[PDB]
Structure formats: C-alpha cells, structure tokens
Amino acid sequence: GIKVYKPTTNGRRNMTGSDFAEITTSTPEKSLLVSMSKTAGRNNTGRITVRHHGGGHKRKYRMIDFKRTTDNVVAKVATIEYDPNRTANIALIVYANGVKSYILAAKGLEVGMTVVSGPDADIKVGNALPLANIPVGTLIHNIELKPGKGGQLVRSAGASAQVLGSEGKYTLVRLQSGEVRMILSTCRATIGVVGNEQQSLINLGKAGRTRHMGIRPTVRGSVMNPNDHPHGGGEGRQPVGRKSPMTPWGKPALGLKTRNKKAKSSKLIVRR
Amino acid sequence: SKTLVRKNESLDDALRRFKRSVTKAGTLQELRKREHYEKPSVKRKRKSEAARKRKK
Amino acid sequence: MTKYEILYIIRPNIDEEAKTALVERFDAILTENGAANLESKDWEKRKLAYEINDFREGIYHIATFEAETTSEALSEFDRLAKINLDILRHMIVKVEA
Amino acid sequence: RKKVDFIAANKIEVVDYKDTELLKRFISERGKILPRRVTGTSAKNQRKVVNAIKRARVMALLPFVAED
Amino acid sequence: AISKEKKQEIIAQYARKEGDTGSPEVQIAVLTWEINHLNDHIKSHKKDHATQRGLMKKIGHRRNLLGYLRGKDVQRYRELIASLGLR
Amino acid sequence: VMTDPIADFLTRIRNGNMRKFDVVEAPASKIKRQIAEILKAEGYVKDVEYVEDNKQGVIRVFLKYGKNGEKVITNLKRISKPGLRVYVKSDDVPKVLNGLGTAIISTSTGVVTDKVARQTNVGGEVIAYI
RNA sequence: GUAGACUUGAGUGCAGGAGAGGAGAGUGGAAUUCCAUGUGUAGCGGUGAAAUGCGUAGAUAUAUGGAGGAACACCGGUGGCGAAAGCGGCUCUCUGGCCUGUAACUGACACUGAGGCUCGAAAGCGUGGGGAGCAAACAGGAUUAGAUACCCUGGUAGUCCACGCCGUAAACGAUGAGUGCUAGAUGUAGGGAGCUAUAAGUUCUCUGUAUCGCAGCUAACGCAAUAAGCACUCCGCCUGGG
C-alpha cells in the first residue's frame, strides 16, 4: 500500500507516498495514558552512550495489551488506529466489564470480531492460545518464554511469525532467516498476522524529514581523525586496507558473530 | 501388493519371472528416456508417431 | 440443494465417546451453517490396508450431506477440518461434480 | 474375449469409485492402470471412469504405488 | 448465467409478449442483467481474460441489441429508454 | 454468404453440370424463376419447380444435357458482382462469343435477352452470359 | 429508399452431455537434495577412459525420521477444450464457449472490419520472497595445433511464488475471416433418433480431428470435406536482388 507524491520540486523528486488509506479516523483515546520519555540515548552517565539519534516529537505512547492474560470475553475491537511508535497498527477493545483494553492490529480484522482466548478459541485470527493448544504449521506471534509475561520476544512489528513444531516442554518455531527457538509449550500466543506489511519500502527525500523521523545523521568513519576512528585519515578519500574496518570502539565488526554461547540459552536453537 | 516371489520359484525361474514380468513392468523405458531432461516440444516428439507407430 | 460428500479418517484407537463428538461438531458446523442433511453418515469404515498419509488402518468417516446452493457453507468446512488433530484425510465432492 | 471397458458388465454408471476391486480391476499388478489399448478403451467413456479413478487411486482406499 | 427462477422471472417481468423468450427486451433482460452480473466476476480477481472476451462478445451482443432496437425498430425502445438507459 | 444467391446459384449449376449430375438448388425468388425461365427457353435446363410453401423454397431443377449427360453450359458466370451493379447503355449492348453466347439484362421494361436488349433500345443491368 | 409481411439465417427459450477452458482457495503421494542418524570401509564420478574432483575429519552405500522447492510416469490418444498463445496429482469457488435436439420467440437483429481496444509465446527487465533439482556467466579436467565448444566436475544469473513490462517467436500448416456447393475408403467424441433383443449389436444425423484418393487442381510437390476445386462480402500483403 504505497502512493506517491507527484514530482513537483527537487527534493520532492521521488517521495514514495504513504497510503495510510486504511486506518480509523483520528484522535486516539485519552485514558491510554503512557508517559513520554526521551533518553536521547544518553544515560545515567549521559555523555552520548548510544549513537546517532533524536528529533521526533512528544510521542504519546499508550498501553497495548502486551500480555492478554484475560479470558473468554466479548473482547470487542472498535477502531484500528495509527501508531507513531511501531510498524504495525493497533486497535481498541472493550470487554464485558466495560474496559478500554487495546491490541496490536493485524492484516484483515474488523471492528466487532471480538476475538479472544480462554484458550477456548479456535484458529481464527486474534486468539491468545498457547502452542500446546495450537496445531502444527501455523502463523502466530506473541510467544514469550516467561508465561504470564507478554511481549519481549518475536511478537514482531514488520511481519508476524510462524511455527514449525513442538515437543514435550517446548515448541519448534522459526522466527525469520532460518531460525528456530523451542519455547515453553504452555506460554501464550496470538494466531494471526502483523498489522502493516509494506512499511519496509518508503523512500523519503529530505534529511530533515528523516530528522522528523528523529535520528541526527550518521558520519562516515573515513575523513575522521586518527584521534577519531581506525579509518586513518590522511591524503584524499584514501582507501582502507587496515584489516576489516570496524567501530570507533575497539572490536572488529564485519564477519565475526559474538554469540555469547555461555548463556541461559543454546538448548533452544536451530543450526544457525 | 508385492509378493516379490513366483510360486515356489527357483533361481532361473525367478530370473525368468523378473525378466518377463519386470520387462513388462515398464520400469526401464521411462528411466532410459529419463537419462536427460528435454524440451516440452520434444516431450511431444515423444507424444507423437512413436506411440502411433506402436498401435497403428 | 445438493448432496455433498466428505470422507475423513481417524486413527482407530480412540473410543466411540470420542466418535460421537467427532461427528457432532461437524453437526455443529452444519448447524452453524445450518445447511445440514438428514444425518451425515459420517463413520462408514470400508477397510484400510494402505498408507496414504502414513497410516495402515484408522477409522473412515463418510459425511455425505445435503446443503444449500453453491455458497459459503460448502467451502466453509475445510478450514475447520484442518483444525482437528484426528483427521487423517478428508474429501469433499458434490453429487456428480 | 470381449472384456472391453467393463461398462456393459457393470451397466450402468455406478459408481465409479465406491468399489474396492470391482471397478478397480482397471489396476495393473504394479498399482498403475490397465492400458487403454490392452483394455482398448472407448475414449471419453474411459474418461468418464478414470476422471474418478484418479481420485479413487489416491483417496486412501487403494495402493497407488506398487509393484509385481 | 442465472438459475431458472430468476431466468424465467426476468423473462416474465421483462417480456413485452408472453412466450416471447427471444424478445429484444428479454435480450436486454438477460444480457443487460449479466453486464453487472458479469462485473462481479471481472472483479473476481480481475484475471479471467477469457471471460473478458465473453464481455467482448456480450457487449457486442448489446451492440446488435440496441443497435437494432434503435436500428430498425425505434420507438418501442424510445418509449423504453428507462429499461436501463445506457451511454 | 447469403449475399449472392445469383452467382451462388450459377456456380451451383457449374457444380451440377461440371459434376455432371441431375438437380441443382435455389431458394425461392422471382429472379431465379426468370433465370431458369429464360435459359430453359434458350434450352439449358429441363425443370421449373420450387418448394411449394417457403420464402426459401428450393427451386430444384433438372438440367438439359448434350447426348451422354454432356454439358451445354460452359462459361457460366454472373457479370454484375454484388459490389458492382453493372449499368450499361442500351444502344451498343455488345455481342457475346461473337453471337455464340447468351445475354440477360434487367432493362427498364424487364429482364430481356441479347438482341431484344440490343435493338429495342432498352438497357439495364448485365446479368449472365455463357 | 419508403412503408409492409413471413421465418425460412442469426440469436434468445426448454432437454442433454462434454472437456488440460480460465481464475482463485486449499490438500496427497512418489521422487530429488539436504539435517541427524545405524555401522562399516574407500569409495563414487564420468566416458573411449581419466584427470576433473569430492571423500579417510572413515563417508558414499546402507537402516530411519525431519526439512524444503520442483513437477505430478501408465491417466495421456491424430483425444478434448480454448481465436490462438496454451491448457494434465487431487478437491472446492464462479466462469465462459459450443454441439445435439428445437419454431417457444424476435422477425434479417446478418457477415464482417481500416481505426481504436484487448489478449498473448519464450526470455529478460521492477519490487518483494522462495530458494530442491537444473542450468547462462565463469572456473577446473580431457580435446587437439588450439578449446573461450560438444564430455565430465562444478557452478552465478535465471528457471518457481505474488506483483508490473516489453509486443517481438517456424505465430506454422511459411495455408486470413464469413458462408454455399459436392465421388467415396476412411478415425474418434457426444448427443439426437431409430437399432439388435430372453443379456448381443447395427443404421442415420452434428460439430471435431486424421489417412488415401473422384472431379477440379498447380511450375511441380501436393490439396481435396476440417479443398492448394468451383463463388461472392470484409480485410490485409506482394512487386528482381542485395
């Protein structure tokens, strides 16, 4: 879903348009209170601590149902709203008790589908079953190794997820890129699909509109000083033959993997 | 299904069973013609007057 | 208006108490569509002695139901046929088409 | 010596898939079909049978692959 | 492309003579019916170009239809513009 | 197509006599009745008959042969094609085969013969020679 | 031309069937390759042979399960459908197009077809995936004077999926479209009808697609009922070669 801008002026040359085109109207709900926060990368210490960054707005976040540990209710979707934050969109929900709960939206849902889990429900889009209930070869997200603990894992803005299999205590699941974790089988799960898909291909001309995105620009390492970077500056834009260029910090970057195989993990793996 | 064995077969008797019946298996023509892959307009050179030469 | 036909198979070691449910939630699918027959004769074992989909013998189930015209109720089924673990193989054809 | 198509024998039209081997002597000994030439078939009436044999070969009521 | 009930029903309403099942008005009935009951199928996936050629020969059948019912006959369609009122 | 039953019909006569067979066919007009009428009068066919109730009534016609089913009609053609209604004068209507050929022309009076078309100063459409 | 009439062409009705007709939505098996894997030793490769190579880090091969893409042998055929291009695991969805009968009905609504429009091989090009096996590009080994080729070992693009485009193919049958005519020997479909009756098996009719060959026919070759024969209406091409 991508319109264009007409190439009127320079800078407005390509300007791959939005096609929001789908989202319910405007005005997100006011008791969706999450306080705004900008570390701007810099820490408790606060020098920079974290690279090129900054320049968005007072991004008034809002509580999505990260966990959805609720039960078998008319969990009515009402609206699918815009997200400033994350790539997929979002949706309001009222239960029987008259609450304002709120979920990540999907591809093809609609207001009044009221989709819910006990894990009573079947395989239709929007159920928080565990994979102990979900059969083989399905398209899920929101599976996190800690039961009673919502999205930290591959509930994914972007595309959703898939599941190959399961055995015993765990679940043989791909994420992307030929990767499988085996997750605790009675941990919750939301069958379905991501909200937005094409929000990987929008090209936007102005450096300043990427500043409206909110990252101050990224320097190359090249013309930087020997004081600055292992790209040893000198005559011209000279090449770098200095054995696989790297961070301004002190480790090589290309190639090597840095697994930390000595983890609370690695018995939950794929070949890669 | 597969009995694999003619009724109290001998060595040369099972040899004649596999020669005769496994020659009428069709188990060799599609393989030797499936040595290499061919163009689908050559697959209807196969589906041509070879079979019409067989029947008519 | 047309008699259909659905042939699924379940692993044999389950019980009749399983079988009554495992035909009557397809009675539930044909009572939520409503386009049900007289009774789906959905258990008729002839005999199995061959592995299509890795079982030598289970329990056949032959539904064979009248329904409505060419509409949502027919092809509504198979999305709720894949969900059962107990299905080995199902089949869905019209009277003669 | 007639033995063509079995159609006049199972006259008429039934089923052609709810037999076990009564229609399915059209099988070869190797799980494939009898020839349309050895059987010597009436072409589209053979299609009127085979258009559901191709079902009934691989409906898990019949060994679709076999030898001997 | 319809059953016998709406087939013979639209013959029944949109016939100007009883038993005139080859009336130009019933050509308007079935043909000018499945123009918009053809649009459902072109909007079904927008891919069946053979059915698009069915729309070609049926637009042309509409072309002989009102090219004739304006062509030789005139006023039994001039009174009957509001059948659907093309163009 | 149906748009030339005249040369369709004469061509069909060439099928009947060149195939050396008995009866040719023609739907019911008045013009074809004048064709088999005038040319039967000039001795080329042997029947004038059509299907008794049809506006497409088959004028089925026995032919007038030579001595062994031998041809009399050889160079049978329609002169005026449907793309050209041939409109000649009346005063110098030309000879056909130096007199050895037929001529039939829808003049202002009717559809009359060669010399009757010549010297009566009547003129119209040229139809057919032999 | 003007008014007028009928169906007897066309089409529309009511009955039949038929198919790899299209487009989506899914499912099944064999088979390839790979993940572990029993447990054992150099094997396998290829040809006219081997070097190619891989492989003792001990495997192929054999025991199994898994993974994935591709495509679906007899079915399959001078078979059908589709204007062709083309279309074949299986099941649904909505989907044209004929033919057989039929006058129930319109009463010539017909045929075309520049223009304009649509579809459309095969690759390739765009974006995003999927990535078994195959294989441009290239490498290695024969090959010989030489091998940038045929063979082998591989192996990139690419082949597949949604999603847009080129508009050019031996487009073919180097045989435009419409309809009329008619020796026959002949295929096969699916109807209509009889038919052959105590179950059998024949005859006519329609569209199909061959093969021979009457007439006709051309420079000859050949065509010939699905005419390269005899007619007419729409179009188009063609003017000695480069």
JSON list of C-alpha atoms in Angstrom, two decimals, chain E:
[
{"chain": "E", "resi": 1, "resn": "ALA", "atom": "CA", "xyz": [-25.61, -17.06, -16.03]},
{"chain": "E", "resi": 2, "resn": "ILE", "atom": "CA", "xyz": [-28.58, -17.43, -13.68]},
{"chain": "E", "resi": 3, "resn": "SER", "atom": "CA", "xyz": [-30.97, -20.12, -12.44]},
{"chain": "E", "resi": 4, "resn": "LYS", "atom": "CA", "xyz": [-34.36, -20.88, -13.97]},
{"chain": "E", "resi": 5, "resn": "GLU", "atom": "CA", "xyz": [-36.30, -18.94, -11.33]},
{"chain": "E", "resi": 6, "resn": "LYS", "atom": "CA", "xyz": [-34.64, -15.58, -11.98]},
{"chain": "E", "resi": 7, "resn": "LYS", "atom": "CA", "xyz": [-34.17, -16.58, -15.62]},
{"chain": "E", "resi": 8, "resn": "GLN", "atom": "CA", "xyz": [-37.85, -17.16, -16.27]},
{"chain": "E", "resi": 9, "resn": "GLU", "atom": "CA", "xyz": [-38.69, -14.47, -13.72]},
{"chain": "E", "resi": 10, "resn": "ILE", "atom": "CA", "xyz": [-36.78, -11.83, -15.64]},
{"chain": "E", "resi": 11, "resn": "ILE", "atom": "CA", "xyz": [-38.38, -13.17, -18.81]},
{"chain": "E", "resi": 12, "resn": "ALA", "atom": "CA", "xyz": [-41.71, -12.80, -17.02]},
{"chain": "E", "resi": 13, "resn": "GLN", "atom": "CA", "xyz": [-41.28, -9.19, -15.92]},
{"chain": "E", "resi": 14, "resn": "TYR", "atom": "CA", "xyz": [-39.05, -8.02, -18.75]},
{"chain": "E", "resi": 15, "resn": "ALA", "atom": "CA", "xyz": [-41.01, -9.63, -21.59]},
{"chain": "E", "resi": 16, "resn": "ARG", "atom": "CA", "xyz": [-43.34, -7.48, -23.67]},
{"chain": "E", "resi": 17, "resn": "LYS", "atom": "CA", "xyz": [-45.13, -10.56, -25.02]},
{"chain": "E", "resi": 18, "resn": "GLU", "atom": "CA", "xyz": [-45.94, -13.82, -23.29]},
{"chain": "E", "resi": 19, "resn": "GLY", "atom": "CA", "xyz": [-43.75, -16.63, -24.59]},
{"chain": "E", "resi": 20, "resn": "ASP", "atom": "CA", "xyz": [-41.51, -14.14, -26.42]},
{"chain": "E", "resi": 21, "resn": "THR", "atom": "CA", "xyz": [-38.37, -15.59, -24.87]},
{"chain": "E", "resi": 22, "resn": "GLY", "atom": "CA", "xyz": [-36.32, -14.23, -27.78]},
{"chain": "E", "resi": 23, "resn": "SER", "atom": "CA", "xyz": [-37.66, -10.69, -27.47]},
{"chain": "E", "resi": 24, "resn": "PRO", "atom": "CA", "xyz": [-35.14, -7.86, -27.84]},
{"chain": "E", "resi": 25, "resn": "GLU", "atom": "CA", "xyz": [-36.45, -6.77, -24.45]},
{"chain": "E", "resi": 26, "resn": "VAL", "atom": "CA", "xyz": [-35.52, -10.14, -22.98]},
{"chain": "E", "resi": 27, "resn": "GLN", "atom": "CA", "xyz": [-32.13, -9.80, -24.66]},
{"chain": "E", "resi": 28, "resn": "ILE", "atom": "CA", "xyz": [-31.95, -6.63, -22.59]},
{"chain": "E", "resi": 29, "resn": "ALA", "atom": "CA", "xyz": [-33.12, -8.68, -19.60]},
{"chain": "E", "resi": 30, "resn": "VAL", "atom": "CA", "xyz": [-30.54, -11.45, -19.57]},
{"chain": "E", "resi": 31, "resn": "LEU", "atom": "CA", "xyz": [-27.74, -9.55, -21.30]},
{"chain": "E", "resi": 32, "resn": "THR", "atom": "CA", "xyz": [-28.17, -6.21, -19.54]},
{"chain": "E", "resi": 33, "resn": "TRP", "atom": "CA", "xyz": [-28.59, -8.35, -16.41]},
{"chain": "E", "resi": 34, "resn": "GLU", "atom": "CA", "xyz": [-25.26, -10.12, -16.63]},
{"chain": "E", "resi": 35, "resn": "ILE", "atom": "CA", "xyz": [-23.34, -6.99, -17.55]},
{"chain": "E", "resi": 36, "resn": "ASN", "atom": "CA", "xyz": [-23.43, -6.05, -13.85]},
{"chain": "E", "resi": 37, "resn": "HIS", "atom": "CA", "xyz": [-23.79, -9.71, -13.02]},
{"chain": "E", "resi": 38, "resn": "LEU", "atom": "CA", "xyz": [-20.63, -10.02, -15.14]},
{"chain": "E", "resi": 39, "resn": "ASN", "atom": "CA", "xyz": [-18.82, -7.25, -13.26]},
{"chain": "E", "resi": 40, "resn": "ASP", "atom": "CA", "xyz": [-18.91, -9.41, -10.12]},
{"chain": "E", "resi": 41, "resn": "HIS", "atom": "CA", "xyz": [-16.71, -11.92, -11.93]},
{"chain": "E", "resi": 42, "resn": "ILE", "atom": "CA", "xyz": [-14.30, -9.46, -13.53]},
{"chain": "E", "resi": 43, "resn": "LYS", "atom": "CA", "xyz": [-13.87, -8.04, -10.04]},
{"chain": "E", "resi": 44, "resn": "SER", "atom": "CA", "xyz": [-13.39, -11.65, -9.03]},
{"chain": "E", "resi": 45, "resn": "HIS", "atom": "CA", "xyz": [-9.57, -11.49, -9.21]},
{"chain": "E", "resi": 46, "resn": "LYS", "atom": "CA", "xyz": [-9.51, -9.29, -12.38]},
{"chain": "E", "resi": 47, "resn": "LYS", "atom": "CA", "xyz": [-7.72, -12.07, -14.29]},
{"chain": "E", "resi": 48, "resn": "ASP", "atom": "CA", "xyz": [-10.05, -14.24, -16.43]},
{"chain": "E", "resi": 49, "resn": "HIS", "atom": "CA", "xyz": [-9.43, -12.59, -19.77]},
{"chain": "E", "resi": 50, "resn": "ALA", "atom": "CA", "xyz": [-11.48, -15.31, -21.47]},
{"chain": "E", "resi": 51, "resn": "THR", "atom": "CA", "xyz": [-14.46, -14.03, -19.51]},
{"chain": "E", "resi": 52, "resn": "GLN", "atom": "CA", "xyz": [-13.32, -10.56, -20.54]},
{"chain": "E", "resi": 53, "resn": "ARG", "atom": "CA", "xyz": [-13.74, -11.82, -24.11]},
{"chain": "E", "resi": 54, "resn": "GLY", "atom": "CA", "xyz": [-17.18, -13.02, -23.04]},
{"chain": "E", "resi": 55, "resn": "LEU", "atom": "CA", "xyz": [-17.76, -9.41, -22.08]},
{"chain": "E", "resi": 56, "resn": "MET", "atom": "CA", "xyz": [-16.49, -8.52, -25.56]},
{"chain": "E", "resi": 57, "resn": "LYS", "atom": "CA", "xyz": [-18.97, -10.72, -27.38]},
{"chain": "E", "resi": 58, "resn": "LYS", "atom": "CA", "xyz": [-21.75, -9.72, -24.97]},
{"chain": "E", "resi": 59, "resn": "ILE", "atom": "CA", "xyz": [-21.02, -6.01, -25.26]},
{"chain": "E", "resi": 60, "resn": "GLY", "atom": "CA", "xyz": [-21.23, -6.70, -28.98]},
{"chain": "E", "resi": 61, "resn": "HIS", "atom": "CA", "xyz": [-24.47, -8.57, -28.42]},
{"chain": "E", "resi": 62, "resn": "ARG", "atom": "CA", "xyz": [-25.66, -5.44, -26.65]},
{"chain": "E", "resi": 63, "resn": "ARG", "atom": "CA", "xyz": [-24.37, -3.52, -29.66]},
{"chain": "E", "resi": 64, "resn": "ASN", "atom": "CA", "xyz": [-26.51, -5.52, -32.06]},
{"chain": "E", "resi": 65, "resn": "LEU", "atom": "CA", "xyz": [-29.23, -5.39, -29.41]},
{"chain": "E", "resi": 66, "resn": "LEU", "atom": "CA", "xyz": [-29.76, -1.68, -29.10]},
{"chain": "E", "resi": 67, "resn": "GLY", "atom": "CA", "xyz": [-28.15, -1.02, -32.45]},
{"chain": "E", "resi": 68, "resn": "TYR", "atom": "CA", "xyz": [-31.14, -2.97, -33.76]},
{"chain": "E", "resi": 69, "resn": "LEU", "atom": "CA", "xyz": [-33.83, -1.84, -31.33]},
{"chain": "E", "resi": 70, "resn": "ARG", "atom": "CA", "xyz": [-32.68, 1.64, -32.29]},
{"chain": "E", "resi": 71, "resn": "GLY", "atom": "CA", "xyz": [-31.65, 0.34, -35.72]},
{"chain": "E", "resi": 72, "resn": "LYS", "atom": "CA", "xyz": [-34.83, -0.90, -37.41]},
{"chain": "E", "resi": 73, "resn": "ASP", "atom": "CA", "xyz": [-37.27, -0.69, -34.54]},
{"chain": "E", "resi": 74, "resn": "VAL", "atom": "CA", "xyz": [-37.01, 2.77, -32.99]},
{"chain": "E", "resi": 75, "resn": "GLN", "atom": "CA", "xyz": [-39.98, 3.84, -30.90]},
{"chain": "E", "resi": 76, "resn": "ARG", "atom": "CA", "xyz": [-40.64, 0.67, -28.92]},
{"chain": "E", "resi": 77, "resn": "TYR", "atom": "CA", "xyz": [-37.26, 1.43, -27.40]},
{"chain": "E", "resi": 78, "resn": "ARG", "atom": "CA", "xyz": [-37.78, 5.21, -27.41]},
{"chain": "E", "resi": 79, "resn": "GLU", "atom": "CA", "xyz": [-40.70, 4.59, -25.09]},
{"chain": "E", "resi": 80, "resn": "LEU", "atom": "CA", "xyz": [-38.43, 2.06, -23.36]},
{"chain": "E", "resi": 81, "resn": "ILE", "atom": "CA", "xyz": [-35.28, 4.07, -22.71]},
{"chain": "E", "resi": 82, "resn": "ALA", "atom": "CA", "xyz": [-35.67, 3.59, -18.96]},
{"chain": "E", "resi": 83, "resn": "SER", "atom": "CA", "xyz": [-35.07, -0.16, -19.17]},
{"chain": "E", "resi": 84, "resn": "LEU", "atom": "CA", "xyz": [-31.58, 0.72, -18.08]},
{"chain": "E", "resi": 85, "resn": "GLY", "atom": "CA", "xyz": [-30.68, 3.82, -20.12]},
{"chain": "E", "resi": 86, "resn": "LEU", "atom": "CA", "xyz": [-27.16, 3.26, -21.44]},
{"chain": "E", "resi": 87, "resn": "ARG", "atom": "CA", "xyz": [-24.42, 5.71, -22.51]}
]
